């Protein structure tokens, strides 16, 4: 559905890019749908119709997605490449078409077929309400991490100092 700021990713957390939001699964988990994560299993006979990958069952991708370069991408994003970003589904247009969503610091370039070759600002809209967490840009995406000067204490999984 519509992955928004209020979406609660089950067994996962929220990330933000230039023009959309997504759910990223904790540890080594996989996405069964857009908002829930479950443990991914190579597939065997006992593991039939279990998650073999992101949006994939048994290892073929789910309806609407296609296995492109060892991962599952929506069918409308088959041949679209953005470079400093990723292809997503255009929410506004009814025929959902592959449009580019860029990493933090880049925006779609009008003089480059809306590819991620233009430097631009992206304001983080994530509400990091957890203890001593704020929105920070980690590896080109926004995510909820410990605030300035705090380290996650593995004894409690909380940001302390």
């Amino acid at each position: 559905a519509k992955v928004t700021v209020d979406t609660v990713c089950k067994r996962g957390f929220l990330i933000q890019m230039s023009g959309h939001l997504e759910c990223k699964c904790e540890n080594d988990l996989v996405l069964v749908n857009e908002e829930t994560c479950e443990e991914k299993v190579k597939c065997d006979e006992k593991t039939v119709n279990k998650p073999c990958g992101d949006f994939s069952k048994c290892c073929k991708c789910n309806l609407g997605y296609d296995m492109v370069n060892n991962v599952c991408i929506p069918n409308e994003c088959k041949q679209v490449t953005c470079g400093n970003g990723k292809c997503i589904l255009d929410t506004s247009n009814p025929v959902k078409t592959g449009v580019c969503s860029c990493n933090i610091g880049k925006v779609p370039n009008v003089q480059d077929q809306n590819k991620c070759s233009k430097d631009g600002e992206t304001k983080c809209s994530l509400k990091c309400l957890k203890e001593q967490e704020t929105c920070k840009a980690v590896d080109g995406i926004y995510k909820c991490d410990c605030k300035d000067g705090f380290i996650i204490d593995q004894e409690s999984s909380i940001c302390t100092g």
Partner: antibody
Amino acid sequence: QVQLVQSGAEVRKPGASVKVSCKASGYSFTSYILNWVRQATGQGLEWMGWMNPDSNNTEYAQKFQGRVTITRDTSISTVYMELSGLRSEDTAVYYCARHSFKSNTGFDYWGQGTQVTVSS
Amino acid sequence: LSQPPSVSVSAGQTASITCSGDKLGGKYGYWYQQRPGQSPILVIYQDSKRPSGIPERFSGSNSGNTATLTISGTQAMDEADYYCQAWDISTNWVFGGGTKLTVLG
């Protein structure tokens, strides 16, 4: 530490060109974009353009009709701002400041300023 | 961006400098202090954050069409020109008109 050091003050005649430099140290040059801001004695800060040393791409202000030319030199970690067709409007102090769209820091560090005077 | 040209505050009181824009709530707000003769310094970045060395008396807010800079207990060393900044897609970097903060008393 991180420092942005510009060239010295210059005086130019109406119609000539002026080329101001900006030296960068203490940080990865290609990581941040270097802007150019000027300010007349009366008025406030006015953005004119920037140079991204990672992509060699420049963006200029519409009001500066092809007169601002920003060229880089990552060898010396120096960006140059050349202004042509000088008029009385160009008599101002010129600043270079860096910013990151990846870290969203704004103009965290500025230059020392270069006062360019346009007189006969 | 639009700022009031002059703002006077009594010494020790709270001064508020507003910055109005088209859709400023969706942009990051940056505030700069410029004393006469020298270069401006960043005092507030990312709407509400302050860089290291800036006293805790400087605060920032940004929502809707107004971004406000608030200084509690304004001192004599705060009389300077405060500028507003935000990045727009069409015109890249935009500065505010300025604000001369006068500390009375």
